C-alpha cells in the first residue's frame, strides 16, 4: 500500500537548521527500512521503547519525522534524558520517547569551504526547552543586569550562532544529518507498518 516517502526526507536537497528543525508527517504507507541503507555511511541508528528486530510487525497512529543537522560530538545529545546546548535550547526529547533517531555524516555534501553559514544553532536562552518545542525568535538575549533595548554589543549577544562547518574540521566536528522518527500511537487505526 504505497511506500513511505522516506526519500523526500533522507534525499532532501537541504536540511533545516537545528534551531528550526522540520517536521514531516508520514502516514498511509509501509515503512520499508531495508531500502534506507546504502545511503551514506550512517553514524547512529539506536531505538528506545521498541525492539528494532520486530519493527516490521507493528504500526502506529502516525510517525513524525524531524530533520536537522548537528556536529558529531553533539549528536549524542539527541536522546531522552540528555543534557547539553541542543538538549536544553534547540531540540529536547521527552523521557518517554516512543520512537528513535538516525544520523549520518554529510561532510562531503554539507561543509562549504571557508564556513557554511546556512546553519545556525541557538547558543543562548533564558530557560530550557520543553519536549518537542520550537523556538525561532531572534530577540537579543541579555546576560547581565544592564538592559540593552534590543541592541547587540556588550553583555547582549545575538542568540543564534552559525555553524562553522569546514572540510578541514575534526573527525567529529563535521556536520551530521539527523532524522528523528517519533512513533505516536493512540486508539486510532494504524498507519505505517512494513511487510509482515
Amino acid at each position, epitope marked *: 500500500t504505497n511506500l513511505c516517502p522516506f526519500g523526500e526526507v533522507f534525499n532532501a536537497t537541504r536540511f533545516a537548521s537545528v534551531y528550526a528543525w522540520n517536521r514531516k508527517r508520514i502516514s498511509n504507507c509501509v515503512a520499508d527500512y531495508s531500502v534506507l541503507y546504502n545511503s551514506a555511511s550512517f553514524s547512529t541508528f539506536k531505538c528506545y521503547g521498541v525492539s528494532p528486530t520486530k519493527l516490521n510487525d507493528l504500526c502506529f497512529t502516525n510517525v513524525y519525522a524531524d530533520s536537522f543537522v548537528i556536529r558529531g560530538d553533539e549528536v549524542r545529545q539527541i536522546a531522552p534524558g540528555q543534557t547539553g546546548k541542543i538538549a536544553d535550547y534547540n531540540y529536547k526529547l521527552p523521557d518517554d520517547f516512543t520512537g528513535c533517531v538516525i544520523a549520518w555524516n554529510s561532510n*562531503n*555534501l554539507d561543509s*562549504k*569551504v*571557508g*564556513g*557554511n*553559514y546556512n546553519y545556525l544553532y541557538r547558543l543562548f536562552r533564558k530557560s530550557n526547552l520543553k519536549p518537542f518545542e520550537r523556538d525561532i525568535s531572534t530577540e537579543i538575549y541579555q546576560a547581565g543586569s544592564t538592559p540593552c533595548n534590543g541592541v547587540e554589543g556588550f553583555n547582549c549577544y545575538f542568540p543564534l550562532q552559525s555553524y562553522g562547518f569546514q*572540510p*578541514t574540521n575534526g573527525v567529529g566536528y563535521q556536520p551530521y544529518r539527523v532524522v528523528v522518527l517519533s512513533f505516536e500511537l493512540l486508539h486510532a487505526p494504524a498507519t505505517v507498518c512494513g511487510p509482515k
Partner: antibody, heavy 120, light 109 residues
C-alpha cells in the same frame, strides 16, 4: 551537462593588469566554491586561488599572494580573477573548477580553461 | 608539494599501481585525496573521488586506496586509451590545495 567558458586573454607585457572571467551555467553557481588552477606549458597542475560560496572568504597560493584578486558575482552568474604585477614565469593555462555536489574541498567540473602568455 | 613517479609503464591487461606520498598534514592525517586524469590537450577531469570512491560515469577498473601516509591508484586491465597524465590531489591544513605533480602511463605498443 554543465558549461564553463573562460573569457581569456592574449599575450600581455610583464607587470600589467589582466581580468579573466569564467561564466558557468547548467548548475547552481551560488551554492559552491569555484577554484582557479594554473598549468604551465608542459608542467603539472598547481592550485592558484579559491573563493567561498558567497565571496566572504578567499584563499590564494603562496606564489600569488598579494598580487592576484579572485571575486565573483551571482547576479549574472560569473567569476572574476584580476591579475596585477605579472611575471614572465606566470604564463600558463587557467582552469575554472567548480567543486560540485558531494564534494567542495575537491575540484570536479574543470571547465575548458583559457591561456595566458606573459612575454615581453 | 607531493612526490610521484616520473613515469610508469605497463602492457595492457595486467594491474598497474601509481603511488604518491606526502607529509602527515597533506594525506597522512586528512583522507581527502582525489586523483585526476588529464589527456593530452584536454581539461583534467576527476577520476577517484575521495580517498576510495569514484564519481558516477567513470570506469569501474580504476580503484583508489590509502596505505598510511601514501595514496595509491590501481588500474585493472588498462587499455591503450588510458594513456594520459595522472595527478593525486590533497587538501592540507589552512587550505593550500597541493597537487601530485606528474605521472604518465604508456602502453607497450
Amino acid at each position: 551537462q554543465v558549461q564553463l567558458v573562460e573569457s581569456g586573454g592574449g599575450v600581455v607585457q610583464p607587470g600589467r593588469s589582466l581580468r579573466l572571467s569564467c561564466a558557468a551555467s547548467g548548475f547552481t553557481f551560488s551554492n559552491y566554491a569555484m577554484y582557479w588552477v594554473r598549468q604551465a606549458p608542459g608542467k603539472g597542475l598547481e592550485w592558484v586561488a579559491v573563493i567561498s560560496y558567497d565571496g566572504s572568504n578567499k584563499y590564494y597560493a603562496d606564489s600569488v599572494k598579494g598580487r592576484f584578486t579572485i571575486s565573483r558575482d551571482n547576479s549574472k552568474n560569473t567569476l572574476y580573477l584580476q591579475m596585477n604585477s605579472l611575471r614572465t614565469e606566470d604564463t600558463a593555462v587557467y582552469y575554472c573548477a567548480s567543486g560540485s555536489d558531494y564534494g567542495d574541498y575537491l575540484l570536479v567540473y574543470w571547465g575548458q580553461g583559457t591561456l595566458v602568455t606573459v612575454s615581453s | 608539494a607531493l612526490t610521484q613517479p616520473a613515469s610508469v609503464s605497463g602492457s595492457p591487461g595486467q594491474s598497474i599501481t601509481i603511488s604518491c606520498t606526502g607529509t602527515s598534514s597533506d594525506v597522512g592525517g586528512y583522507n581527502y585525496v582525489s586523483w585526476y586524469q588529464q589527456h593530452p590537450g584536454k581539461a583534467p577531469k576527476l577520476m577517484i573521488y575521495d580517498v576510495s570512491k569514484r564519481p558516477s560515469g567513470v570506469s569501474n577498473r580504476f580503484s583508489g586506496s590509502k596505505s598510511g601516509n601514501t595514496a595509491s591508484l590501481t588500474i585493472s586491465g588498462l587499455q591503450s586509451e588510458d594513456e594520459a597524465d595522472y595527478y593525486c590531489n590533497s587538501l592540507t591544513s589552512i587550505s593550500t590545495w597541493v597537487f601530485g605533480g606528474g605521472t604518465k602511463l604508456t602502453v607497450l605498443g
